[PDB]
A paper describes a structure:
Human p97 ATPase is crucial in various cellular processes, making it a target for inhibitors to treat cancers, neurological, and infectious diseases. The molecular mechanism of p97 ATPase has been extensively studied with a variety of methods, including X-ray crystallography, nuclear magnetic resonance (NMR) spectroscopy, and single-particle cryogenic electron microscopy (cryo-EM). These approaches have revealed a dynamic molecular machine with three distinct functional domains: an NTD and two ATPase domains, termed D1 and D229–31, each harboring conserved Walker A and B motifs typically associated with ATP binding and hydrolysis. A stable and functional oligomer of six p97 monomers assembles without a requirement for binding nucleotides. This homohexamer structure appears as two concentric rings, formed by the D1 and D2 domains, that create a central pore capable of binding protein and peptide substrates for segregation or degradation. The triazole inhibitors bind between the D1 and D2 domains and at the interface with an adjacent monomer.
To investigate the structure of the R155H NTD mutant with triazole-class inhibitors, we used single-particle cryo-EM to solve the structure of p97R155H proteins with NSC804515 and NSC819701. NSC804515 and NSC819701 share the same pyridyl triazole core and cyclohexenyl thioether but differ in substituents at their termini. Compared to NSC799462, NSC804515 has a 2,5-difluoro substitution pattern on the aryl ring rather than a 3,5-pattern, and a propionamide at its terminus rather than a carbamate, reducing its length (27.4 Å) compared to NSC799462 (30.1 Å). When bound to NSC804515, although the NTD densities were fragmented and did not allow us to build their peptidyl backbones, the NTDs are oriented in the up conformations, as shown for other p97 NTD mutant structures. The NTD mutations, including R155H, could disrupt the interactions between the NTD and N-D1 linker and between the NTD and D1 domain, thus favoring the NTD up conformation. The terminal group of NSC804515 can interact with the adjacent D2 domain, whereas the 1,2,3-triazole on NSC819701 can interact with the residues on the helices α1 M and α1 J limiting their relative motion and enforcing the NTD down conformation in the R155H mutant. The IC50 values for p97WT and p97R155H mutant are also similar for all three triazole compounds, whereas the IC50 for K512N is 7.5 to 12-fold higher for NSC819701 and NSC804515, respectively. In general, when comparing these mutants to p97WT, NSC804515 and NSC819701 were all more than 30-fold resistant to P510S, N616F, and F618S and only 7- to 12-fold resistant to K512N.
Residue numbers in the entry:
A (entry chain A), B (entry chain B): 200 to 428, 437 to 718, 726 to 763
Amino acid sequence: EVGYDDIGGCRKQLAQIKEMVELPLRHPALFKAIGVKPPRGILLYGPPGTGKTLIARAVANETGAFFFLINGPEIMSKLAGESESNLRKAFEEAEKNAPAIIFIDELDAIAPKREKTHGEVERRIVSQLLTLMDGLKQRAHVIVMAATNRPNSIDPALRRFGRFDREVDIGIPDATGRLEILQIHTKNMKLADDVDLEQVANETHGHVGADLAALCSEAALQAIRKKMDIDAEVMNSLAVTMDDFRWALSQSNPSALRETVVEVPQVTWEDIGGLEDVKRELQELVQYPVEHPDKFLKFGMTPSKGVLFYGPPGCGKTLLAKAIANECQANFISIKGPELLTMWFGESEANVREIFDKARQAAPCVLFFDELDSIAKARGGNIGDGGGAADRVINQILTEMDGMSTKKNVFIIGATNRPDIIDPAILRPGRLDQLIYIPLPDEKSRVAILKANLRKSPVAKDVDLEFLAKMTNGFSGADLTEICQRACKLAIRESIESEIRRERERQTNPSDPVPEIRRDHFEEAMRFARRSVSDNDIRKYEMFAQTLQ
Amino acid sequence: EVGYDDIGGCRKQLAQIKEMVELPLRHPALFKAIGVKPPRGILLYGPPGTGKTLIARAVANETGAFFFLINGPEIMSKLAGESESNLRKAFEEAEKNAPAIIFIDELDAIAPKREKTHGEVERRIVSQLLTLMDGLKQRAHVIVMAATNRPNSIDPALRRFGRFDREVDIGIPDATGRLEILQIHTKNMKLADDVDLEQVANETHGHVGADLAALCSEAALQAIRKKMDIDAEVMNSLAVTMDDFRWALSQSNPSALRETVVEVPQVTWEDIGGLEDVKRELQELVQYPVEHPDKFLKFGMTPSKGVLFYGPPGCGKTLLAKAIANECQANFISIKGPELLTMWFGESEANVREIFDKARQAAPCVLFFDELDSIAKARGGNIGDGGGAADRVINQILTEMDGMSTKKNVFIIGATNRPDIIDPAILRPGRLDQLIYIPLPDEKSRVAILKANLRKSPVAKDVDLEFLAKMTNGFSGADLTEICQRACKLAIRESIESEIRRERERQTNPSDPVPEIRRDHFEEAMRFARRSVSDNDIRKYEMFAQTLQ
Ligand SMILES: CCCCCCSc1nnc(COc2cc(F)c(C#CCNC(=O)CC)cc2F)n1-c1cccnc1
Ligand SMILES: CCCCCCSc1nnc(COc2cc(F)c(C#CCNC(=O)CC)cc2F)n1-c1cccnc1
Ligand SMILES: Nc1ncnc2c1ncn2[C@@H]1O[C@H](COP(=O)(O)OP(=O)(O)O)[C@@H](O)[C@H]1O
Ligand SMILES: Nc1ncnc2c1ncn2[C@@H]1O[C@H](COP(=O)(O)OP(=O)(O)O)[C@@H](O)[C@H]1O
Ligand SMILES: Nc1ncnc2c1ncn2[C@@H]1O[C@H](COP(=O)(O)OP(=O)(O)O)[C@@H](O)[C@H]1O
Ligand SMILES: Nc1ncnc2c1ncn2[C@@H]1O[C@H](COP(=O)(O)OP(=O)(O)O)[C@@H](O)[C@H]1O
């Protein structure tokens, strides 16, 4: 017995499921009278152990309609001739009792791709499912929900309209999502109040709901370990501590890892520092078009869907993209350059189709291509010994973007660091056409940069950031954060040494730690760190701008 | 009849199995009351003949719960329709008697990958296993342990949560592990006390437990050979000698060989010699973060998970990595450069996924990439005629490291010998960012180098190491150990000649050997050996440092 309370983190997708499953069953009269056909099939997918079955059970219980789970493994387990008979009688009994939510779990196993169905019985059961789904077009209220993984894995015949009209990408839960999952799974534990259940959540990046349940179980198991060997005083005094969740997190690998995260970033224009002019430009390029479509219709100009950041390597490209995504409260589909390089090397571009389809599934998206044309940098860079500017994977990206100029809800951003090797085919209308030269931080900006970076970390009042900013003239944002991290490392090394010697003194014959960062650490760090981008590079970018501006 | 005593070397993994199999069966009450779901499936894998079946039997006998071994071969041997019936009735009788440890041996054979299951009956039995494992979710206490090899070989559907939650990488036993195995298998032998049973253990690198049992049997068989043809005086006087284990070791090839070893090194900061500053740096980069996480949380700086050693080719890179791993009592997943070159040439990067997954399975790891960007050296080196700095396999390594910044228990080390060809994509936060320029040994250091190398070998008092160190100014550590080995070779050649002439004199008409190394051998060796790294190379590394520092 579960319900809407049990599901956590899944809110947008759960909201869609609520929308799509409540009205056709709880209130079928108005749909029948109006004549609009409700979605017969609802294919919700995602990585394994994401709560697909749990979501289906919860929505079925909340609706109160008749429910009949169907599992792909058990259907396939039966002898030939009995699997299709079982499916047929399941659909029949659903029809006889039909305010109904049929649920086909692991649809991929029962109905994989056409060419990877090796046996004849496999194709027979697939066709049986097809004909049952088509024949349940009758007005009897049955909704055939299906759970799978990698929706491209199932036979595309099922994805055709009239069988599975609507798709739901559950995806990985975000930070708040993982916090909700942990709250749900740690409700009946009597956990010690010392743990927060939120510090662990932010550190469980890439964990899926099943992995979070496993982490909670492993933390409880570590709590058992800490206890020796009595029946009442051990089960009553059990209180999982933060030191137990730490162990569970350490000894628990994520499963749905390195799958492109569909999440809202958490920079909100404050992690980024100043630049005082590109914030307004990004707002006007992506905030005004959505806030005031009427004006854009009046003067008759299609808003630019693409922006290609270019500048010194590391000055706030990814930070700008994340910040503008957060301001719009939109998903941010990060695509690092290494994955594009793997795309080019793997000789497989269908994964680009997959990535763009997943971006399209997330309605408000800020699809971000970091290190764009890193493929050009790989194939000889400026020399171009491999060939011309155009290359393999960027061609597929161009095709998809040309096809993705109609969604008008996925703002594509590019962050090439070497604009001179950018293939000109992508600087065309309908593609990343708007060019914003985010420059190296200025004197007035570096103080804000350091204030943002030193945030969330104690800092003494002695340090004067203005003089440090003037001292670091041509330093890039990456170099500024490197200086901050180096100073922090020096300060923590000093603190650790102080604590070690204090403990040694206390334990020996005898029987403040400077909990702040002071200017000596900052200057010591400055001695080491140096600007990583040469004057030649910024001159080259300025020359590119002059070619444009 | 076996038990915990029989299992040897497997302690960490056996400890995990004890944890995971005792409490759910011996004390099921507290788990039921608390509500945390114990791990239903426990997939323990490793190379063949590693004791997987033996470990399962031992834990089952120690628990005392009902046990029912299931073998993949015999299940598959039955006629179609009888294999699934056999599996079903096995699960049923386990349920009827269910404090239970079901054991599916050779899970790969019964349930291989989805696409490599050719017949329809194969898929039917796989689905039968899936549905049985899902349907045994009931509170009846059955634990479905499974033994396999290369866990990527089994159908990934089984690895999903709720079926096989927990994975156990048994791995090769270490030196102490092989010693324990030999002790177990040589308990009832009446072996002669002359043999130590530990000299053989250190020389059986890559041997698996089954191979160790075979080695013991072959040693006993050689002992039989030495005996001619009586029933009592031959079986009672049998005493295997070290000369028999020597033969067995010689005529016994390892099976689980050249599989990346998950073992703790044995250098413990003493095999390495001095350098007097990078020991502290490594300690502060990997020892302080784990010892004092609270300070790292206070000042708010994510500790650097990666370090990229760079310097003259051969000065203690691998030695430093092994030493820092040993100091932390952590596994050391060595990855030599040749295997990366094979990765690049093989056109297969899924093995990089496999390597990183295996590293993640070992919780405390010091993953070490020796000769990093040797691929760059292969594709034209500094010229880069092949193309840009970025290449094929290092891209996959970068992706995995980006995904491996959350484990916070696998410290990644790189030991590039040519930093100028290192792809800059790996010198970024979240990757191998901290750079430590381990230099050529100094005058004060070479004496320690020679003291360490000459250790465990007799040395005369006449040799003066300080003058030799001054004589070898720019010599690298590889060159110093080469000098030591050459001097030892000259000394042992002299000793062998002396012994040969002494034996010849004794055997002829007539009827100290200098058991030490003296300065004449050292100077004779010095005449030959010369520094292998030129002044140009060290100047280049210094220039790289100046570009950084
Ligand atoms: C959203 C959260 C931040 C990140 C992603 C969302 S971005 C977003 N959300 N909604 C929109 C608005 O889309 C459009 C509105 C229009 F009026 C028009 C028009 C017109 C006039 N036609 C003609 O004259 C001839 C036919 C075209 C649009 F595409 N955009 C958007 C689209 C494009 C660029 N920037 C923003
Ligand atoms: C272990 C045996 C030797 C070889 C392998 C083991 S190495 C090991 N074992 N435990 C650890 C500690 O991990 C971490 C601890 C932390 F406090 C933090 C933090 C923080 C602050 N967050 C923020 O401000 C914003 C979110 C991050 C960690 F990743 N490490 C380790 C990790 C990284 C580098 N060096 C060592
Ligand atoms: N959104 C969620 N809310 C609560 N629990 C979840 C959620 N997602 C996953 N889980 C947990 O993960 C597990 C998923 O198990 P299962 O249903 O077998 O796999 P799947 O969810 O992929 O079908 C459940 O035990 C559930 O408690
Ligand atoms: N304008 C900025 N404000 C604050 N931090 C910045 C800024 N630019 C760069 N950084 C720092 O640099 C890091 C991110 O670098 P990024 O700008 O993403 O590199 P790239 O532009 O090559 O993607 C962050 O840790 C961030 O703190
Ligand atoms: N950790 C261990 N302790 C004792 N013996 C072992 C160990 N590992 C392997 N062996 C030996 O290796 C053999 C393994 O045989 P078998 O069980 O058929 O293969 P596997 O162990 O891979 O299932 C046994 O005879 C056992 O004596
Ligand atoms: N600092 C050192 N102390 C002791 N031995 C060293 C040192 N540096 C190199 N060696 C010797 O060199 C050999 C290992 O070479 P290594 O440093 O691994 O080469 P590389 O650094 O190219 O991987 C060992 O036999 C070791 O005795």
